[PDB]
Amino acid sequence: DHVSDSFLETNVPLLVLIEAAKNGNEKEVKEYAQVFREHANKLIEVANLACSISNNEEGVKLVRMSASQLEALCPQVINAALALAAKPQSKLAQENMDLFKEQWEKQVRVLTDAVDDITSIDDFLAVSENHILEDVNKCVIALQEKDVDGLDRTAGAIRGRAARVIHVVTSEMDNYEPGVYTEKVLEATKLLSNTVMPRFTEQVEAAVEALSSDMDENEFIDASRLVYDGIRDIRKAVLM
């Protein structure tokens, strides 16, 4: 491997590219467009290596796709810049730039987390901690905005990732010689699957119950935060 999120996640070349084009600096635009591209290719090559050594079928598919969409978008982004550099004034040109910027940053993020999910268990558990806590914050928020859809989909994304964590780690422990280490990891996963997730789902269904009908907000927040704690406990246990 030998790569950091720092390299994978950066949109710096993009941002800087957009800055040039923003002020008709045709010179640097062609300079930055080249760094952008070079960065994207390396990102795609790194992603390619991650796959070869990986056994995860679905995990690789995700990386492949995410990597493809980056190839397709790249040219579109550079060109969209040249369209702005030539007409920094063109309101149309500006909009396209940002829209492309969003599309690009979302895929770069998808790619980072995807590559990380197949790099190693700690990486996978680290990504799992971020998505979970972020999904938890969204849930809490969706609940407060009585956004049943948000709550429902977000709580679903949480259950899916936690179930994925539970399977990947329990499965992982199967490769080790049973001991204090492994038993402590399994204790932590069973805590999540047998006690914490159920109560969480219990909270969600009830929240989606009231809302779509004629509750304790702090209860939900506690139940949800607990899902994050069980994930962190699993990760820590696995780091022993």
Curated annotation (Swiss-Prot):
Coiled-coil boundaries: none
Post-translational modification: Sumoylated. Phosphorylation seems to contribute to the strength of cell-cell adhesion rather than to the basic capacity for cell-cell adhesion.
Domain of life: Eukaryota
Record localization: Cytoplasm, Cytoskeleton; Cell junction, Adherens junction; Cell membrane; Cell junction
Assembly notes: Monomer and homodimer; the monomer preferentially binds to CTNNB1 and the homodimer to actin. Component of an cadherin:catenin adhesion complex composed of at least of CDH26, beta-catenin/CTNNB1, alpha-catenin/CTNNA1 and p120 catenin/CTNND1. Possible component of an E-cadherin/ catenin adhesion complex together with E-cadherin/CDH1 and beta-catenin/CTNNB1 or gamma-catenin/JUP; the complex is located to adherens junctions. The stable association of CTNNA1 is controversial as CTNNA1 was shown not to bind to F-actin when assembled in the complex.
Similarity field: Belongs to the vinculin/alpha-catenin family.
Protein role: Associates with the cytoplasmic domain of a variety of cadherins. The association of catenins to cadherins produces a complex which is linked to the actin filament network, and which seems to be of primary importance for cadherins cell-adhesion properties. Can associate with both E- and N-cadherins. Originally believed to be a stable component of E-cadherin/catenin adhesion complexes and to mediate the linkage of cadherins to the actin cytoskeleton at adherens junctions.
Disease listed for this protein: Germline CTNNA1 truncating mutations have been detected in patients with hereditary diffuse gastric cancer (HDGC) and may play a role in disease susceptibility. Diffuse gastric cancer is a malignant disease characterized by poorly differentiated infiltrating lesions resulting in thickening of the stomach. Malignant tumors start in the stomach, can spread to the esophagus or the small intestine, and can extend through the stomach wall to nearby lymph nodes and organs. It also can metastasize to other parts of the body.
Name of protein: Catenin alpha-1
Gene: CTNNA1
Residues of the full protein shown: 388 to 631 of 906
